[PDB]
Design a protein around this ligand. Structure first.
Ligand code: BEF
Ligand code: MG
Length: 880
């Protein structure tokens, strides 16, 4: 807004509105051109496109044409089945992205209305929506801010810009003008919308309404709401086009060859018979070339995914998300509340006499001197622990009693022994807090402050008893330790019991001198106890890790060095450094960005977009509101358990236990799911190709096409639908974790699978053609039946040769997969239903079909899968 670069009273002139009062005519006029202070989602959601957008898929167009042709051919049944499964495949994909919509209601709940406003010179109160630039709004601690603006009177107020910066601590606000261009996190002279004023009073001008404000910027990034195609969807459509082209090639080929047979025929030939024969062949190939169960099967192999994840407290609302995490190569994480748990804890302490490397066990254990600081630090804090144990108060102050409760020392047993009734004033200047302390019969006035200012009024030191003041080795060692702790980016605090006043009625500002300081403590928001392994695990898995944070660069650069994200001598950049960097050099810097710091929401979505353009498919994990842009823009979003509902509803995956390990464990599952679908689709498609090779051979030899409609249909959507899922249920290979991330550009069958698909699909059709020849010698009706028996049995038995393209069924656990054998037996039954005397004529099986003919055809299908199994071992190929 550049207002923080501007002056205080100078801003009201450019707003041309008075700071004292806003007339009713100002409200009218300014509402007419700036509108209300409201956001409404601009989503038509007509669902007409969504119903039509399923016809954008080439797999569906061919089936519509085939079913329409099936209708005029008197083939009503086998056409209505196609219409059924087309509506099935449509209903899947429409509601797969209906729920993938950003909950702008969740962000609407932070509107925070009914804000005190000076209207017509009278102090009044109205909703947030009726606010417009130039108006004067009042802030008192405890209410939220209706909209962003610049404060022209600071009553020492501290606000919590958590939804912008990612830090939940109160930051002081200054009325003074900052004549400098700095970042978005350090807008000290102006406030923003949606933040809670933790402390102090204040007045401010509001530069903008709910539109073109910071939460409105986040809302725009969320309103784009365009998630890229998943690796599965991208690959599958890039192959669905190639698949659809084969149909309009083969239909033309059939319409041509059938016409070619009319020229050389004796007395020409029957013309309508040739045309109609071409049409029967055309529908027979169109139904066989498309695996119409592929959507109903891919959705179920994904049905396994988030179920395996639900046992680890990681929910997935959108199914296609699972496979995405497999192909991920760049993981971008949030610093506060994701790598950490937002809890403030102490890692090391400094006392004049005792500084053990590790904090000791229990107060009845160490017993080293008089723990004066341990006794006064629980008195100088203002944090409370409820019966629930939940956290309330300033986050820096809770670190005094949380670390105390960790060391077998209750937070009440020491706060009840000593009774303090202090003046507890504000910390506008010097960051001071006085109190009344009663020990034995003497008095004290404990006071806490920043180590750089609390030592300025310090006039005593003491180790192992009272040592009064000292000049050397005392004022130089405190700087040594405070500076080494600030080099570790540890928030250090100084606490001095100060027994300056005694039995006085009230503590005065003048008598805060002669301070006697006990000790210093270094608190920091520490990483999760489970994040350190998730980094070595991701690096050995081929995943580059990147931290995207909006906090200070010191803590952001310190965190991660211990974790190992960046190198031992790497450098981070600020959000200002990204506000001025264009896209030309950013992509050359994007490979050495390492870790960011003090970034804005738009900076997070920027990095995700840049990585996508780089060619790497990425993932985003964050917990607050300032991550929802990056989540919705990323391929998949992972929200934390304690994170706000904005990220929870704008993310595809939501883990609830804050266990970051489950992130890396997700990739291992991802690559597995895909690896199964690859070997599932293969199995389902090879059996399709074999059905085509058998049809085409009957056209070039002018035989009755070995299959009919409703027959191939039943094989595709009912018969093989079970073994495809069974192959989906296969076990994961231990070599999956080390393998480099699968590229987004390679095909589905890339990696040696394509050769396996063509091998198995050729063997199926070859056996089927032979069976049709035998039947053709017996009778034309027989050939159809024998060919169908061979197809429905060879695709069934193909599961054994299709469990793995690199290994045989024997030696890889023949009975290992209970689902594979279950499917082979169930498909034996699903074929037995064909020979029933009631359903024998609805499958075009003749009444003369005996067991000897079945012996022949089944021997052929058996020998076909036998061929496949011996073929698999023939070569050193298929290894990638
Ligand atoms: F809490 Be994160 F670092 F934005
Ligand atoms: Mg966070």
């Amino acid at each position: 807004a550049e207002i923080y670069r501007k002056s205080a009273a100078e801003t009201f002139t450019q707003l041309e509105a008075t700071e004292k009062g806003l007339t009713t005519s100002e409200v009218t006029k300014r509402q007419e051109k700036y509108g209300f202070n409201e956001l409404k989602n601009k989503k038509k959601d007509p669902l007409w496109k969504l119903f039509l957008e399923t016809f954008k898929d080439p797999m569906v167009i061919v089936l519509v044409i085939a079913a329409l042709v099936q209708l005029v051919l008197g083939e009503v049944v086998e056409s209505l089945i196609i219409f059924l499964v087309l509506i099935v495949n449509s209903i899947i994909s429409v509601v797969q992205t209906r729920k993938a919509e950003s909950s702008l209601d969740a962000l609407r709940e932070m509107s925070a209305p009914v804000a005190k406003v000076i209207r017509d010179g009278s102090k009044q109160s109205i909703h947030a929506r009726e606010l417009v630039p130039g108006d004067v709004v009042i802030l008192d601690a405890g209410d939220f801010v209706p909209a962003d603006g610049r404060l022209f009177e600071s009553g020492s107020l501290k606000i919590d810009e958590g939804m912008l910066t990612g830090e939940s601590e109160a930051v002081e606000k200054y009325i003074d003008t900052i004549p400098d261009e700095v970042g978005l996190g350090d807008r000290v002279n102006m406030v923003f919308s949606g933040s809670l004023v933790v402390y102090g009073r204040g007045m401010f001008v509001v530069t903008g309404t709910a539109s073109e404000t910071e939460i409105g910027k986040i809302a725009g990034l969320l309103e784009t709401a365009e998630a890229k195609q998943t690796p599965l969807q991208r690959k599958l459509e890039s192959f669905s086009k190639k698949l659809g082209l084969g149909i309009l090639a083969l239909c033309v080929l059939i319409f041509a060859v059938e016409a070619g047979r009319v020229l050389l025929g004796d007395n020409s030939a029957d013309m309508a018979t040739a045309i109609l024969n071409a049409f029967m062949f055309a529908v027979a190939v169109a139904v066989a070339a498309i695996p119409e169960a592929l959507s109903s099967i891919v959705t179920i192999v994904l049905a396994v995914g988030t179920n395996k994840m639900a046992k680890q407290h990681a929910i997935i609302r959108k199914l296609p998300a699972v496979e995405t995490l497999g192909s991920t190569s760049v993981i971008c994480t949030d610093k506060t509340g994701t790598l950490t748990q937002n809890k403030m804890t102490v890692v090391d302490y400094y006392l004049p006499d005792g500084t053990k490397e590790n904090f000791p066990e229990s107060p009845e254990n160490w017993s080293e001197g008089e723990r004066r600081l341990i006794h006064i630090a629980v008195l100088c804090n203002d944090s409370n622990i409820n019966s629930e144990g939940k956290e309330l108060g300033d986050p820096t102050e809770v670190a005094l009693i949380a670390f105390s409760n960790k060391n077998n020392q209750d937070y009440n047993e020491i706060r009840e022994k000593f009774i303090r009734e202090g003046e507890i004033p504000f910390d506008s200047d010097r960051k001071l807090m006085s109190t009344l302390h009663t020990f034995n019969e003497n008095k004290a006035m404990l006071t806490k402050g920043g180590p750089d200012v609390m030592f300025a009024r310090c006039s005593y030191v003491f180790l192992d008893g009272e040592e009064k003041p000292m000049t050397e080795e005392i004022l130089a060692k405190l700087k040594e330790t405070n500076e080494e702790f600030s080099n570790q980016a540890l928030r250090v605090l100084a606490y001095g019991y100060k027994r300056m006043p005694a039995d006085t009625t009230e503590l005065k500002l003048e008598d805060e001198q002669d301070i006697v300081l006990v000790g210093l403590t270094a608190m920091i928001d520490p990483p999760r106890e489970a994040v350190y392994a998730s980094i070595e695990e991701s690096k050995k898995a081929g995943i580059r890790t990147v931290m995207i944070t909006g906090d200070h660069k010191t803590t952001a650069q310190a965190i991660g060095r211990d974790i190992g994200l960046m190198d031992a001598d790497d450098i981070a950049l600020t959000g200002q450094e990204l506000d001025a960097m264009p896209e030309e050099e950013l992509d050359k810097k994007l490979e050495h960005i390492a870790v960011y710091a003090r970034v804005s929401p738009e900076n997070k979505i920027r990095i995700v977009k840049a990585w996508q353009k780089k060619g790497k498919i990425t993932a985003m994990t964050g917990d607050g509101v300032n991550d929802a842009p990056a989540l919705k823009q990323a391929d998949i979003g992972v929200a934390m358990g304690s994170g706000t509902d904005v990220a929870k509803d704008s993310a595809a995956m939501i883990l609830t236990d804050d266990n970051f390990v489950s992130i890396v464990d997700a990739v291992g599952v991802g690559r597995t799911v895909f690896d199964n679908i690859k070997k599932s689709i293969a199995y389902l498609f090879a059996g399709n190709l074999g059905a085509i090779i058998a049809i085409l051979f009957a056209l070039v030899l002018d035989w009755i096409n070995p299959f009919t409609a409703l027959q191939l249909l039943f094989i595709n959507l009912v018969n093989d639908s079970l073994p495809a899922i069974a192959l989906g249920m296969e076990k994961a290979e231990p070599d999956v974790m080390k393998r480099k991330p699968r590229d987004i550009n390679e095909g589905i069958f890339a990696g040696g699978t394509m050769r396996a698909v063509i091998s198995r699909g050729v063997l199926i059709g070859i056996a089927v053609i032979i069976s049709q020849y035998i039947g053709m010698q017996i009778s034309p009706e027989m050939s159809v039946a024998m060919a169908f028996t061979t197809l429905i049995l060879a695709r069934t038995l193909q599961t054994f040769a299709a469990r793995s393209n690199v290994q045989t069924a024997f030696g890889a656990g023949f009975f290992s997969n209970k689902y594979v054998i279950g499917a082979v037996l169930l498909c034996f039954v699903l074929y037995g239903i064909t020979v029933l005397p009631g359903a024998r004529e609805i499958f075009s099986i003749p009444a003369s079909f005996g067991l000897h003919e079945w012996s022949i055809a089944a021997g052929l299908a058996l020998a076909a899968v036998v061929m496949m199994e011996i073929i698999k071992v023939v070569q050193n190929k298929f290894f990638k």
